[PDB]
Design a protein around this ligand. Structure first.
Ligand SMILES: CCCCCCCCCCCCCCCCCC(=O)OC[C@H](COP(=O)([O-])OCC[N+](C)(C)C)OC(=O)CCCCCCCCCCCCCCCCC
Ligand SMILES: CCCCCCCCCCCCCCCCCC(=O)OC[C@H](COP(=O)([O-])OCC[N+](C)(C)C)OC(=O)CCCCCCCCCCCCCCCCC
Ligand SMILES: CCCCCCCCCCCCCCCCCC(=O)OC[C@H](COP(=O)([O-])OCC[N+](C)(C)C)OC(=O)CCCCCCCCCCCCCCCCC
Ligand SMILES: CCCCCCCCCCCCCCCCCC(=O)OC[C@H](COP(=O)([O-])OCC[N+](C)(C)C)OC(=O)CCCCCCCCCCCCCCCCC
Ligand SMILES: CCCCCCCCCCCCCCCCCC(=O)OC[C@H](COP(=O)([O-])OCC[N+](C)(C)C)OC(=O)CCCCCCCCCCCCCCCCC
Ligand SMILES: CCCCCCCCCCCCCCCCCC(=O)OC[C@H](COP(=O)(O)OCCN)OC(=O)CCCCCCCCCCCCCCCCC
Ligand SMILES: CCCCCCCCCCCCCCCCCC(=O)OC[C@H](COP(=O)(O)OCCN)OC(=O)CCCCCCCCCCCCCCCCC
Ligand SMILES: CCCCCCCCCCCCCCCCCC(=O)OC[C@H](COP(=O)(O)OCCN)OC(=O)CCCCCCCCCCCCCCCCC
Ligand SMILES: CCCCCCCCCCCCCCCCCC(=O)OC[C@H](COP(=O)(O)OCCN)OC(=O)CCCCCCCCCCCCCCCCC
Ligand SMILES: CCCCCCCCCCCCCCCCCC(=O)OC[C@H](COP(=O)(O)OCCN)OC(=O)CCCCCCCCCCCCCCCCC
Ligand SMILES: CCCCCCCCCCCC(=O)OC[C@H](COP(=O)(O)OCC[N+](C)(C)C)OC(=O)CCCCCCCCCCC
Ligand code: SF4
Ligand code: SF4
Ligand code: SF4
Lengths: 70, 316, 176, 378, 156, 97, 101
């Protein structure tokens, strides 16, 4: 019957879900649980590099809050 | 971790292409009152694997090509570019977050014509060359409408960034304000990928250019061709059927976005089973006399419509 | 009597002309064709599950030639050669001589199943229901020489398919 | 001009000036088997199975043409019930041929789906062949004198159940082709034949009726009981592929109309002429009566003698006018048997019909002529 | 593990792939081509076995000769056979192709296609039923299943 | 409601073949898991089933034996394994087993 | 560096499949087998090129709509598209878009 066509669709459907699911998880793993920063324009890049210097550890995604201010 | 990311994109693409062959053979079967593969594995789930092994242990021809170096360059270029067109796709986060991603996909897509042209030369057959020339003239003709239609849509979006199309459709699908463009974009994607009713290459009784290829080299052209069918339908869903993105639950986007991308890929198989084939002079007239006049007119309309409503999108 | 197939004059009123403009621009009759293929997607396919299911046949089916016996075990053929005379392909070869007990019996009966056109004239000509075409249609071979039947192969077929051959002849001999 | 020997059972030698076809040169004979010479070493009954294999899509209509010719030289008449059977299966054969003609005409130009829907109908009609004769295709069921056997009980009910639903199958076929703009573009104003060129080139069948010529042998020179049934002859107006496609689709409907009358007006009686010097006796009376054994012996070894003479007999076969110029010398074996295949003259007009058309149109023009090379080459 | 054990299982993997994906090139010459179309029709649906309906000569694994081979056609047949990439099998369908059949004694007919090309399976009948050709195809699958190419190379 | 009944029949095929193991055995040998009425068994082990709700052509099928004449037929089934007495019923040349 | 790795992986992968495709069956040992310029096609390519170049001048339109001179910008945008349509009309009427000899 027609529903015997679905199992092929499920495999094809799952294979198109892995690339999207993998990229989202790998970014969070590599960016300390946050989305990967988006820097399309020079101003955004300048802030990101500044965050690298302010973190102490040379990482753009380690955010320092008020507790870092005297 | 980025290298792991690339493999998490490439292998699933090839597996999806492998099982698209099965799904195509079974959807076509049921629309023809039959079943399709259901013997090689349960419901034909091992049919793709059998076909792959068979082709890769079958002796290849490699005739007396005029070059013998274009014969090996053509499938490398086809498959190499086909996988490259996936790296900027937001699903919902791109592997490579390009600022001009929409323009990157046009650029790489226009290079796929060389593999059609080079394989024509390598075959060394005068007739096989004629088939390559007709295929090339078809591809370049219909990417005129891909470029202008895309420009018209981006006038309602404001950038060439692919992830900005997600923001643009955060209140409503672009299929609603731009359905006339969606129609001519959908048909223009069939012609680009040599799909019925535009498959003169595979349309025997008039000609294909990849006729001298067998075994593994033939499968490489096949894999690239089908990966482009999935990619163009993923592009269409992003462009005209935007899926809402929740930053806390990105998997929700991927499931909804995949279902749309599958439904549009099955529409390609649906259209193959329903219509006869265009004549070469008739698909050219469908472009130079019907689509192009409307595409140019709609481009004028979409340059002016945002201005006269005060609806110009932000640059950023 | 006769009828015209393509002799209609399309109306030229505004509503009719606009109807064909919507059809041209909105692809109405093409989407009408997509719906028909969609309906077949939800119909039960007509495929049968061969080899576990078989296609229906009838008692008159013409398959593998065979030589029959009387209920006593004596051969029905009496070397009359009517089948050899009527065979349009000249696929039958026969030789006969008096048997040890004096009966008129063959010493050769060959059918070339590659000359044969499976026409059934051999079993119409036979006056004693000796040469018949049975119901077996699955007897493909791997070599050309296995399809040149001799009297031993044909008598083995008759003993092998007698149970089904007799029942078919019982079901159809009233039409012959 | 560029020349292509497309080759392989048709070898086409064409010269093309770019996209246009400047000349078409069909090379045939790749299926010539010497049928007409073999018929001269056979009795009239032994040559009957050859005609199933000429136009192997319309098997039972080639038997009828050969049977009409022999019955004419014999000066005998088939019994009324046999004639009604020979019309019932003549129209069933006409459904088999038009499905093959239309659906393989559409499959060669891309539309592959209607082929599978309608070949499930052909399969069911192959059971009607198999239930009367025992063979799906080459029945050899129609013979000089009538038909070999009588219909088995219950077959006419199964023919009725099939015919009841067929008209719906045609409608689904027309939902895919008739109004589809892609189909029309491939078949409209393609291969236009003038009503005067068609007659002078030897055309017959829908090749004439497509150009407005009102001609059908079933109505003008009837045979068997075609003058006791009601049907309409489709007629074209533009003489192109599209009009000829509509004539075959509409002839499938007029066959269902004839079949509905054969099932209701089928008389009782015997199914072969009651003259045992032409048609063999019953097996029951062949095993009890001396004359019936003598006549069975001679009919299956020597065959019946046919008085000297020659005849040209023709029918309205599915593909056009099919006939034989049968010549007799007064013995059991025919002297000469020429076969007139409608596709022989139709394919000789391919060069004329393909002037000023593209190469891809030659595919459609070959399809619209409904060519089967079993009859073209013999 | 033994070498004779790995080769036995590798032989089963290549045989399984080859017999499960037979792509035929059909030489439809005469009436036997009609019965071959009914094998692709919905009733039997060759495609559900992995046997595609139509394949080009260079993408094909089996040649089905369905009809009468004439003397004007024989050179074309041999040319197509020589251009088939290996492994390649030939199925002879019908009396005409097997031995000439009804036209055996004709001046223009090759008496059997097996004197022009090698033949693996002979399917008898005039024509064979669509269920008889299908039985022959499944008999070619089992023949490919018995191949022992690797088990004979290992013993050279 | 009718959606529910479809799933119920899908489950009752698993129980109608003797659990999962029997259900999988007929899914890999026959590629079909329908359940029919047993009509009989021949001396070689073949089992014959009928289901008259199925459309003509699928209403009779045979599940071949796993061994015949000393040959392992678990995977290598063959249509010529049907003996003549059942060859007539299975091909619908008669209505009487 | 990321975009460079992505391109390297895709084309490196394609090359591997190609070479192992031409060699894996050659691990097998099969017996050795032994043994017009068209003008209209050229005009399609040239027409595409001139149309393709005019598209290059239209791609920056989305950024051009962000200016404070919309009256001037909208005048030239409709001029380029109108001129592109004039080229199509000229070829159409001069039988450029035909495939019949
Ligand atoms: C190698 C095998 C053959 C590959 C053919 C395909 C070429 C890839 C296209 C070039 C990359 C590109 O398009 O950049 C767009 C994109 C455009 O992205 P963007 O404009 O959005 O900017 C990205 C960064 N922001 C947004 C922050 C400004 O380029 C990049 O993203 C990064 C640029 C990296 C530059 C390194 C290029 C070196 C490789 C070029 C040589 C290619 C040789 C080709 C050999 C001949 C074959 C044609
Ligand atoms: C005519 C033949 C060719 C036509 C091709 C038709 C196939 C293309 C798909 C058309 C159907 C649209 C997809 C419906 C299934 C999508 C499932 C899904 O994403 O969630 C439901 C989606 C959920 O919406 P969403 O997640 O996509 O977000 C909507 C975005 N806003 C909020 C801006 C509108 O909604 C539906 O599509 C219901 C229908
Ligand atoms: C207030 C301001 C409003 C401004 C905008 C107003 C717009 C008004 C509407 C304008 C018309 C709409 C444009 C529609 C496109 C017309 C293109 C055209 O050329 O038509 C004629 C063309 C051809 O027309 P023709 O062949 O019949 O003849 C042309 C003219 N003569 C007769 C002179 C030759 O139609 C086609 O494109 C053929 C279709 C090929 C087969 C395609 C298969 C369709 C499968 C269904 C897909 C459904 C779409 C899926 C979309 C999914 C997207 C996610
Ligand atoms: C991604 C594509 C590339 C894949 C690379 C290769 C690795 C993939 C392995 C996949 C193996 C699939 C084999 C499945 C066989 C099967 O399903 O049963 C068939 C058959 C099923 O029966 P059947 O097919 O013979 O019968 C069919 C007819 N009916 C329907 C009646 C049953 O089972 C067999 O008996 C065949 C035995 C095959 C044994 C294969 C063992 C391989 C072991 C690995 C070898 C070393 C690897 C290196
Ligand atoms: C990418 C996805 C596809 C991946 C492909 C996976 C394939 C998995 C199986 C690979 C191993 C089998 C390939 C070699 C089989 C070749 C063959 O069938 O013939 C054996 C061949 C036959 O050689 P031969 O010595 O018997 O005879 C050759 C010369 N003739 C024929 C003329 C007599 O032997 C081999 O070369 C096998 C080498 C060992 C393989 C390990
Ligand atoms: C079968 C009948 C229908 C026919 C088939 C239809 C097409 C196939 C279905 C579409 C493709 C979807 C393929 C993926 C489905 C299986 C995966 C899934 O359902 O979602 C799992 C997802 C994983 O969870 P995860 O991302 O790890 O969250 C961790 C948070 N700390 O969990 C989530 O987070 C989800 C939110
Ligand atoms: C409501 C009010 C609406 C406005 C009124 C409607 C517009 C009127 C003009 C429409 C009719 C056009 C003239 C025409 O009929 O052209 C037909 C002709 C087709 O000829 P052909 O196809 O070769 O014939 C084949 C026969 N076998 O074609 C020709 O011969 C030439 C056709 C050239 C078409 C050029 C297309 C490019 C222009 C695209 C539109 C872009 C906008 C142009 C700028 C507008 C500025 C305001
Ligand atoms: C608007 C709806 C009313 C209408 O169309 O007019 C109806 C009117 C009555 O119909 P009728 O008697 O047939 O008159 C036509 C005889 N020449 O018919 C008329 O006479 C009305 C005037 C006829 C001329 C109108 C031409 C209309 C086509 C112009 C192009 C319209 C383009 C619209 C945009 C298309 C894209 C969506
Ligand atoms: C269902 C699953 C089973 C199916 C088969 C799939 C199996 C998955 C594995 C296949 C791919 C092979 C394994 C991947 C090897 C990648 C090598 C690697 O780890 O990366 C090292 C190298 C450069 O990477 P990196 O060190 O990060 O350089 C950054 C400098 N700033 O990397 C490179 O230089 C790139 C070299 C090109 C990529 C190699 C070819 C990939 C295709 C094989
Ligand atoms: C705005 C322009 C509006 C006019 C559009 C003209 C192009 C339309 C296609 C031409 C079809 C036509 O109507 O006939 C053109 C006519 C041809 O000559 P004819 O004798 O009538 O017939 C053919 C004989 N061989 O005569 C011609 O061929 C002349 C037209 C072809 C050359 C195009 C000229 C366009 C004018 C420029 C318009 C844009 C203004 C640019 C200003 C920039 C100044 C630097
Ligand atoms: C590299 C390409 C593959 C080479 C295979 C090979 O050389 O594999 C050799 C080994 C065993 O070695 P051996 O007994 O010396 O066989 C050498 C070959 N002879 C005996 C024919 C000379 O094969 C296996 O165990 C299984 C191989 C999988
Ligand atoms: S079926 Fe016909 S051709 Fe075959 S052996 Fe019998 S009489 Fe001869
Ligand atoms: S017709 Fe019958 S009895 Fe006479 S030779 Fe032939 S098989 Fe024997
Ligand atoms: S074997 Fe029979 S059906 Fe096949 S081509 Fe020859 S005569 Fe025709």
């Amino acid at each position: 019957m027609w529903f015997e066509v679905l199992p092929g669709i499920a495999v094809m459907g799952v294979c198109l879900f892995i690339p999207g699911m993998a990229t989202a998880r790998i970014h969070r793993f590599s960016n300390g649980g946050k989305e990967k920063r988006v820097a399309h324009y020079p101003y955004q890049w300048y802030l990101m590099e500044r965050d690298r210097r302010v973190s102490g550890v040379n990482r753009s995604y380690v955010s320092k809050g008020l507790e870092n201010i005297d | 971790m980025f290298m792991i990311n690339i493999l998490m994109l490439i292998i699933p693409i090839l597996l999806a292409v492998a099982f698209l062959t099965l799904v195509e053979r079974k959807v076509l079967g049921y629309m023809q009152l039959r079943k399709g593969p259901n013997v090689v594995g349960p419901y034909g789930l091992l049919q793709p694997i059998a076909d792959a092994i068979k082709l890769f242990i079958k002796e290849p021809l490699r005739p007396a090509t005029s070059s013998a170096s274009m014969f090996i360059l053509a499938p490398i270029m086809a498959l190499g570019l086909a996988l490259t067109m996936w790296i900027p796709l937001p699903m919902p986060y791109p592997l490579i977050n390009m600022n001009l991603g929409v323009l990157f996909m046009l650029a790489m897509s226009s290079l796929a014509v060389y593999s059609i042209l080079w394989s024509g030369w390598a075959s060394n057959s005068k007739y096989a060359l004629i088939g390559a020339l007709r295929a090339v003239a078809q591809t370049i003709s219909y990417e005129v409408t891909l470029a202008i239609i895309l420009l018209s849509v981006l006038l309602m979006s404001g950038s060439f960034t692919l992830s900005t199309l997600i923001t643009t459709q955060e209140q409503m699908w672009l299929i609603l304000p731009a359905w006339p463009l969606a129609m001519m974009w959908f048909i223009s994607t069939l012609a680009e990928t040599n799909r019925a009713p535009f498959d003169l290459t595979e349309g025997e009784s008039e000609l294909g250019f990849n006729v001298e290829y067998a075994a593994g080299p033939f499968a490489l052209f096949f894999m690239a061709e089908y990966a482009n069918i999935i990619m163009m339908n993923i592009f269409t869903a992003i462009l005209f059927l935007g899926t809402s993105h929740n930053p806390h639950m990105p998997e929700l986007y991927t499931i909804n976005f995949t279902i749309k991308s599958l439904l549009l890929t099955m529409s390609f198989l649906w259209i193959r089973a329903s219509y006869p084939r265009f004549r070469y002079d008739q698909l050219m007239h469908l472009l130079w006399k019907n689509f192009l006049p409307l595409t140019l007119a709609l481009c004028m309309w979409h340059v002016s419509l945002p201005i006269l409503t005060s609806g110009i999108p932000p640059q950023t | 009597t006769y009828k015209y197939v393509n002799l209609r004059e399309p109306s030229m009123d505004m509503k009719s002309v606009t109807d064909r403009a919507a059809q041209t621009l909105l692809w109405t009759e093409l989407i009408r064709g997509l719906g028909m293929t969609l309906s077949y997607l939800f119909r039960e396919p007509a495929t049968i599950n061969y080899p576990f299911e078989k296609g229906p046949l009838s008692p008159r089916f013409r398959g593998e030639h065979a030589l029959r016996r009387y209920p006593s075990g004596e051969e029905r053929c009496i070397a009359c050669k009517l089948c050899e005379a009527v065979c349009p392909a000249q696929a039958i070869t026969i030789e006969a001589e008096p048997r040890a007990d004096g009966s008129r019996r063959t010493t050769r009966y060959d059918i070339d199943m590659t000359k044969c056109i499976y026409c059934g004239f051999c079993q119409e000509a036979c006056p004693v229901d000796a040469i018949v075409e049975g119901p077996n249609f699955e007897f493909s071979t791997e070599t050309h020489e296995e399809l040149l039947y001799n009297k031993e192969k044909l008598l083995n077929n008759g003993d092998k398919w007698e149970a089904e051959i007799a029942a078919n002849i019982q079901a159809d001999y009233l039409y012959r | 001009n560029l020349t292509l020997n497309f080759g392989p059972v048709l070898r086409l030698v064409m010269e093309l000036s770019g996209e246009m076809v400047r000349k078409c040169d069909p090379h045939i004979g790749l299926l010539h088997r010497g049928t007409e010479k073999l018929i001269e070493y056979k009795t009239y009954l032994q040559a009957l199975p050859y005609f199933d294999r000429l136009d192997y899509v319309s098997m039972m209509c080639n038997e009828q043409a050969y049977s009409l010719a022999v019955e004419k030289l014999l000066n005998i008449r088939p019994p009324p019930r046999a004639q009604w059977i020979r019309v019932l299966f003549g129209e069933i054969t006409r459904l088999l041929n038009h499905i093959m003609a239309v659906t393989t005409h559409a499959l060669d130009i891309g539309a592959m789906t209607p082929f599978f829907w309608m070949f499930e109908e052909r399969e069911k009609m192959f059971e009607f062949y198999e239930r009367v004769s025992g063979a799906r295709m080459h029945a050899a069921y129609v013979r000089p004198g009538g038909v070999h056997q009588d219909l088995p009980l219950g077959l006419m009910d199964d023919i009725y159940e099939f015919s009841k639903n067929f008209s719906l199958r045609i409608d689904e076929l027309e939902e895919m082709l008739t109004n589809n703009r892609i189909w029309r573009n491939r078949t409209v104003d393609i291969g236009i034949v003038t009503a005067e060129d068609a007659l002078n080139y030897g055309f017959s069948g829908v090749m004439l009726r497509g150009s407005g010529i009102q001609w059908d042998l079933r109505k003008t020179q009837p045979y068997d009981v075609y003058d006791q049934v009601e049907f309409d002859v489709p007629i074209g107006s533009r003489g192109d592929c599209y009009d000829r496609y509509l004539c075959r689709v509409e002839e499938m409907r007029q066959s269902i109309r004839i079949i509905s009358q054969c099932l209701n007006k089928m008389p009782p009686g015997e199914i072969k002429v009651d003259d045992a010097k032409v048609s063999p006796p019953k097996r029951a009376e062949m095993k009890t009566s001396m004359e019936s054994l003598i006549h069975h012996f001679k009919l299956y070894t020597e065959g019946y003698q046919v008085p000297p003479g020659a005849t040209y007999t023709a029918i309205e076969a599915p593909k056009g006018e099919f006939g034989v110029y049968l010549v007799s010398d007064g013995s059991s074996r025919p002297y000469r048997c020429k076969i007139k295949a409608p596709g022989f003259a139709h394919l000789a007009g391919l060069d004329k019909m393909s002037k000023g058309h593209m190469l891809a149109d030659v595919v459609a023009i070959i399809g619209t002529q409904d060519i089967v090379f079993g009859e073209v080459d013999r | 593990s033994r070498g004779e054990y790995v080769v036995a299982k590798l032989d089963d993997l290549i045989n399984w792939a080859r017999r499960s994906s037979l792509w035929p090139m059909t030489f439809g010459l005469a009436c036997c081509a009609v019965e071959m179309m009914h094998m692709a029709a919905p009733r039997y649906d060759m495609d559900r076995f992995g046997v595609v309906f139509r394949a080009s000569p260079r993408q094909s694994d089996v040649m089905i000769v369905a009809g009468t081979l004439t003397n004007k056609m024989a050179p074309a047949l041999r040319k197509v056979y020589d251009q088939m990439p290996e492994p390649r099998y030939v199925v002879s369908m019908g009396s005409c192709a097997n031995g000439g059949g009804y036209y055996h004694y004709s001046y223009s007919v090759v008496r059997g296609c097996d004197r022009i090309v090698p033949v693996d399976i002979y399917v008898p009948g005039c024509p064979p039923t669509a269920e008889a050709l299908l039985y022959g195809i499944l008999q070619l699958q089992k023949k490919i299943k018995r191949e022992k190419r690797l088990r004979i190379w290992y013993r050279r | 409601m009718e959606l529910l009944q479809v799933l119920k029949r899908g489950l009752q095929q698993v129980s109608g073949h003797g659990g999962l193991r029997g259900y999988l055995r007929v899914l890999f040998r026959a590629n079909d898991v329908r359940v029919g009425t047993l009509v009989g068994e021949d001396k070689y082990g073949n089992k014959y089933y009928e289901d008259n709700k199925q459309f003509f052509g699928r209403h009779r099928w045979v599940i071949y034996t796993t061994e015949m004449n000393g040959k392992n037929t678990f995977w290598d089934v063959d249509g010529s394994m049907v003996p003549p007495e059942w060859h007539r019923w299975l091909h619908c040349m008669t209505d009487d087993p | 560096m990321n975009l460079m790795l992505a391109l390297l992986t895709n084309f490196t992968l394609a090359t591997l499949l190609v070479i192992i495709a031409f060699w894996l069956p050659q691990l097998n040992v099969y017996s050795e087998k032994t043994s017009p310029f068209s003008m209209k096609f050229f005009l399609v390519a040239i027409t595409f090129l001139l149309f393709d170049l005019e598209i290059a001048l239209l791609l920056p339109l989305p950024w051009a709509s962000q200016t404070a001179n919309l009256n001037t910008m909208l005048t030239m945008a409709l001029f380029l598209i109108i001129l592109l349509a004039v080229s199509l009309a000229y070829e159409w009427t001069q039988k450029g878009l035909e495939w019949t000899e």
